């Protein structure tokens, strides 16, 4: 889908990407990751869960496929019953804009620590 | 036109623009009542000789009242002509017993009689005049439809214009027994309500507490009425 996912990136670098994560059933969840852990428990913002019916599976066996989509919103999915994750869609704001946003967050956090040091005195 | 059923049947077969196709998922229920059974049986045997068993079915009652019987006539997967024929025959027969006891013809309709009747249809209808719908029906599932004061040809034309516009579909399988149980339940409720009619005074209203609950209140209301009459007399007095 001409996204060109990064060639040397991991889960700390794939954050806030619109993932298309596959499970053991095939119940594909599409949404933005915002956190993970050692067991790969993924929170998913604006997530949608898509499946294929049993009648559509005969047409899928060797065209249009009518998938069943349900809307989950902000969910938190476990890492046991998942199989694979890919990157489907890029986020809204770019890498330089995320860098400027992270510098603003660091400056705001340093200002908050200076405010806590001023309130402690 | 004429007063014969078969001539209007030929006319409604002729100029209704290929009306031989029936309606997919079509159902009609006509509950009727007869005073006697023996006169009904010959007309119903002639109807079963004319109309097949798969299209039309009949359902008797349980003989609870022993005087007024209740017979269901269920037309299932019917065409537009057989519906008009069955409704014309039954609407002639359930009024010929009161108007013409000496005519003695189960398929010849006289001129002095007007066809006026009531038939149920399922709720899943789509219409997108003499036959009207009803407001405040008594059946939870079905819709009652009324025809009033028509001749034979007007009855044929109005029933054909009604069934040419309505669209049926996807009826429940044993909905006939459901309608039987609901109809018997509703009319057993109103029969019990008529049974409650002599039991008004002193029977089941707890009169011994109801007198003492309203004994000062009606007295104070009567005092208010006497004060109202006296104040009205003072208001209308010139003096």
């Amino acid at each position: 889908s001409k996204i060109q996912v990064a060639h040397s990136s991991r889960l700390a670098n794939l954050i806030d990407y619109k993932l298309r994560v596959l499970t053991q059933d095939g119940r594909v969840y599409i949404g933005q990751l915002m956190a993970f852990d050692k067991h790969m428990n993924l929170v998913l913002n604006e997530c949608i869960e898509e499946r294929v019916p049993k009648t559509q599976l005969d047409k899928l066996r060797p065209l249009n496929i009518k998938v069943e989509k349900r809307v989950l919103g902000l969910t938190i999915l476990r890492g046991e019953q998942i199989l694979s994750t890919v990157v489907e869609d890029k986020p809204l704001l770019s890498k330089k804009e995320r860098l400027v946003r992270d510098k603003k967050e660091k400056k705001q956090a340093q200002k908050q620590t200076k405010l806590r040091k001023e309130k402690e005195k | 036109q004429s007063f014969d059923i078969w001539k209007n049947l030929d006319r409604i077969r002729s100029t209704k623009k290929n009306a031989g196709q029936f309606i997919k998922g079509s159902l009609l229920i006509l509950p009727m009542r007869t005073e006697d059974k023996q006169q009904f049986d010959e007309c119903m045997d002639e109807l079963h000789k004319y109309i097949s068993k798969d299209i039309l079915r009949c359902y008797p009652q349980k003989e609870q009242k022993d005087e007024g019987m209740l017979f269901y006539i269920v037309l299932k997967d019917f065409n537009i002509l057989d519906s008009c024929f069955v409704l014309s025959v039954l609407l002639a027969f359930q009024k010929r017993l009161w108007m013409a006891p000496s005519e003695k013809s189960y398929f010849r309709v006289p001129k002095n009689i007007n066809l006026t009747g009531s038939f149920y249809l399922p709720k899943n209808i789509e219409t997108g005049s003499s036959i009207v719908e009803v407001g405040f029906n008594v059946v939870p599932d079905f819709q009652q439809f009324q025809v009033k004061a028509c001749h034979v040809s007007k009855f044929m034309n109005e029933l054909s214009n009604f069934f040419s516009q309505v669209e049926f579909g996807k009826c429940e399988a044993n909905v006939i027994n459901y309608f039987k149980r609901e109809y018997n339940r509703t009319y057993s409720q109103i029969s019990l309500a008529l049974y409650e009619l002599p039991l008004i005074g002193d029977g089941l209203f707890d009169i011994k507490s109801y007198i003492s609950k309203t004994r000062p209140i009606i007295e104070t209301s009567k005092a208010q009425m006497i004060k109202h009459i006296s104040e009205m007399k003072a208001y209308n007095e010139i003096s």
Binding site: - | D202, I207, I211, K222, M225, I226, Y235, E237, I238
Partner: protein, 267 residues
Amino acid sequence: NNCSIFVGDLAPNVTESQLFELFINRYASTSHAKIVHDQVTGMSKGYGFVKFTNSDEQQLALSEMQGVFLNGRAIKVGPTSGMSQFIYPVQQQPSLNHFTDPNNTTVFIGGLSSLVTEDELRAYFQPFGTIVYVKIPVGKCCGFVQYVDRLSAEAAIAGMQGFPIANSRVRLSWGRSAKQTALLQQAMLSNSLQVQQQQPGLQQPNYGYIPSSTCEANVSSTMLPGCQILNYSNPQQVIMQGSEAVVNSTNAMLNRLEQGSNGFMFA
């Protein structure tokens, strides 16, 4: 105006009489005063309302009692009443004529041919409801039909409109009584005020009476709600509604047909 002031944080030994003495008769005139006590204990919660007629006297009392010694504590007599989108609607009044009175139940009839009697005019307006008098002015070709109910007057106007009495079309409207018409004529001859008075009510609620119900005629009444309990008599007093009312009405209408076939009454 009825300005309200809310006194708060009062002591326990302060009844409504002490609050009425401290509120009224001190450069003001408090119309009402009530201390909000407990629902089941009877003790005062320390709060009370005082409603006065004038707003200036209540404002002066709230300005003078702000911090006054009230049974060993403060009075706190600041006002309770007086940017949201939702406000209650407010209206003026139609100055109380005989059209805009909802209790006005007497119908002015006109357009008569000066030929109908009083009993016949009673017979025109009898089944619409109970009635009190059917007197008409002489030489004025008009009259007055006063009922008890207002729905009976609505039914009488909605039915009797456009009905020709003795080859003469009727004119139905509202109007006052004879004494109020004499008062309006006495106040209009000098043209000083010409003010009217509202017709008195029914002192509602009234459980027993059923509107638009007539009865012409011991009584063992069960007072059941499906039937009728009390009714106004036909001249007048209050009668208990018996069970043999439709029988007496049927005998009365058969007697009326028998006496009207011959000519003993025209009504």
